[PDB]
């Protein structure tokens, strides 16, 4: 598949939509793979403690750049059973096995022009939909 569903839920923000992923050719970090994430459609919601929507940001066409250690390539097994999502488990922090990090959450600053708040939340969202789902990256060219 080209596009993937993503879902993110936490107490003060949530997001969903679909993303396109592609490997980024690079020669500066031989032990890491770079991936470019393009948001095809989606919204980022900021909510209060009781779930009321305070703000929302259209993610459409936002572009993110991430990297992780090529240890993930040894993940088994790339089998189709069945539909892969980039989903997080609400309030369940996970281990970062492959030193996944975000290089730039919004390259063209479509949302982070709004300020640090958006950057920080977008950064958190990216790590949270990726971590634990790295086996999904195996099929990305």
């Amino acid at each position: 598949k080209q596009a993937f569903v993503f879902e993110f839920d936490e107490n003060l923000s949530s997001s969903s939509g679909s993303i396109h992923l592609e490997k980024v050719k690079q020669n500066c970090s031989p032990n890491y793979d770079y991936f470019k994430i393009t948001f095809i459609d989606g919204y980022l919601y900021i909510k209060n403690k009781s779930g009321v929507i305070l703000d929302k940001y259209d993610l459409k066409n936002v572009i993110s750049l991430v990297a992780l250690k090529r240890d993930y390539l040894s993940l088994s097994l790339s089998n189709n059973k069945q539909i892969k999502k980039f989903k997080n488990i609400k309030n369940k922090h996970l281990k970062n096995k492959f030193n996944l990090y975000v290089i730039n959450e919004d390259i063209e600053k479509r949302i982070t022009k709004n300020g640090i708040l958006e950057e920080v939340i977008l950064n958190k969202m990216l790590l949270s939909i990726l971590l634990g789902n790295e086996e999904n990256l195996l099929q990305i060219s």
Binding site: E10, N11, L12, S13, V24, N27, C28, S29, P30, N31, Y32, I46, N48, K49, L54, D55, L65, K69, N99, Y101, V102, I103, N104, I107, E108, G115, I116, L117, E119, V120, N123, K124, L127
Partner: protein, 487 residues
């Protein structure tokens, strides 16, 4: 352990601990800081000494930036209030950069370049400063929120770090530590000595292995002899670059040893030959990316001195040979063939092995010595299309065996001493004379060759490389200790 330069010409690997220790000694980290009048908030605090920490790779360097006595004001329609922490360890990712050194070199043939943190970038896909999402050893965090904070203090902390990042964006230059300095020899030509060790292009690499930092290194990677970098070169150091015995390691590519020392020298062993019969290629086994061997070109042979064999004068020839670097050794394999006019052919495949080591001449000066390891290993077979009798064949094969067992070690000795020659004197033209008159008691000091190789790179402004180890481990491998000028 065999090592490799990974297609570079020269490699200089220093443990990260040594580099960090040098930083804490020179205290280049700014003390107090403050961000005033920021749109999204403001902050202030104190830094403790910045240090390289684990998580980097190649170009990418992770810095631990410990912060104390911190406070910040957050300004926003949603998140808004005042807070701080007593201590925190901020982790960022940055790159380093080679910049023109000042004052410049008087010799305009040499360009001095300094390795320093890269302070800015105009490529959005390559931020000068990347804040890492790590919340380690945060003490005394506090924040007064005017509304919402069900998601933890981690969120506020991430915001703080971005405020600190805003200050960093305008103040990284305050951390002007020079990691190392490199002499770029532009314009290498004519009668230049040691051209294969004089850098013409330089880059760097952070390398870590699991077990971290203690075993992690910062490397200076050079292309030499006028060569430049390419996609062929990766920012990586082999795990075995630094001798287990030594603090820091210097590597000279086996490819350069073969192309620039032995390949021009080896014809002089055979004034019989035309001199165009040899080549250095990429074909050998097994691990790594690729290995280099010096061999006869396809179709070529080398006539050797005549022998008497069962009543006939015969000319042995080299039908095939391989000179290559394996484990701790310079290895030579020579296939000699002799054809008896009666119609029998002898074939010997003979292998000799040579080690290198740090030694001293009689003036107590450090030098490079060598030794042959054991005796030739031989394989002998034959072809008998003349239906020659067994007794003649046996006597014939005895004579050709004896020739191989004498000739090939003599050949290996020439090569071993030839290679020391090139390393110690740096001039191809002078090697034959060096070989002819070689004597381990009287062999020149390695110091001049060090000046033209390793000391072309200077760490921590004024470090001196104290050599304590030499070996062949694929590429020539130098082991030593950086002496920090006591001051």
């Amino acid at each position: 352990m065999q090592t490799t330069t990974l297609n570079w010409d020269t490699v200089y690997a220093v443990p990260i601990n040594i580099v960090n220790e040098a930083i804490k000694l020179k205290h280049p980290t700014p003390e107090n800081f403050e961000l005033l009048n920021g749109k999204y908030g403001n902050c202030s605090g104190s830094f403790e000494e910045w240090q390289i920490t684990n998580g980097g790779d190649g170009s990418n360097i992770r810095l631990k930036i410990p912060i104390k006595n911190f406070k910040a004001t957050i300004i926003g329609n949603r998140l808004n209030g005042k807070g701080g922490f007593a201590f925190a360890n901020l982790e960022v990712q940055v790159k380093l950069k080679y910049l023109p050194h000042f004052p410049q070199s008087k010799n305009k043939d040499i360009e001095l370049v300094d390795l320093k943190i890269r302070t800015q970038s105009d490529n959005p896909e390559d931020p000068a400063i990347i804040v890492i999402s790590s919340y380690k050893n945060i003490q005394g965090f506090y924040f007064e929120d005017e509304y919402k904070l069900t998601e933890d203090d981690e969120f506020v902390v991430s915001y703080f770090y971005r405020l600190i990042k805003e200050w960093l964006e305008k103040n990284l230059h305050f951390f002007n530590y020079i990691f190392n300095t490199v002499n770029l020899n532009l314009y290498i030509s004519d009668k230049e000595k040691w051209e294969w060790t004089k850098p013409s292009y330089v880059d760097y690499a952070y390398s870590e292995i699991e077990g971290d930092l203690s075993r992690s290194a910062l490397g200076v990677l050079c292309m030499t002899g006028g060569r430049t970098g390419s996609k062929n070169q990766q920012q990586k150091i082999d795990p075995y670059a630094i001798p287990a015995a030594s603090q820091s390691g210097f590597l000279i590519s086996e490819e350069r040893l073969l192309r620039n020392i032995l390949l021009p020298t080896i014809p002089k062993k055979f004034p019989k030959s035309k001199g165009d019969e040899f080549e250095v290629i990429n074909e050998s086994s097994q691990g790594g990316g690729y290995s280099y061997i010096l061999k006869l070109k396809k179709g070529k042979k080398i006539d050797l001195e005549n022998i008497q064999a069962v009543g006939y004068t015969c000319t042995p020839y080299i039908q095939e040979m391989k000179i290559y670097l394996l484990g701790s050794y310079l290895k030579l394999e020579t296939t000699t063939r002799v054809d008896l006019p009666l119609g029998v052919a002898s074939i010997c495949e003979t292998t000799c092995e040579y080690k290198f080591k740090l030694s001293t001449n009689n003036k107590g000066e450090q030098t490079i010595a060598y030794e042959q390891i054991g005796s030739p290993v031989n394989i002998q077979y034959s072809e008998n299309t003349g239906n020659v009798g067994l007794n003649i064949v046996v006597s014939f094969l005895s004579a050709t065996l004896s020739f191989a067992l004498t000739f090939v070690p003599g050949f290996g000795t020439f090569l071993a001493v030839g290679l020391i020659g090139g390393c110690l004197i740096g001039s191809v033209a002078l090697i034959p004379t060096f070989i002819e008159s070689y004597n381990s008691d009287t062999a020149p000091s390695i110091d001049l060759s060090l000046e033209n190789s390793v000391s072309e790179i200077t760490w921590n402004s004024s470090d001196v490389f104290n050599l304590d180890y030499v070996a062949l481990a694929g590429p020539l491998q130098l082991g030593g200790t950086l002496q920090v000028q006591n001051s």
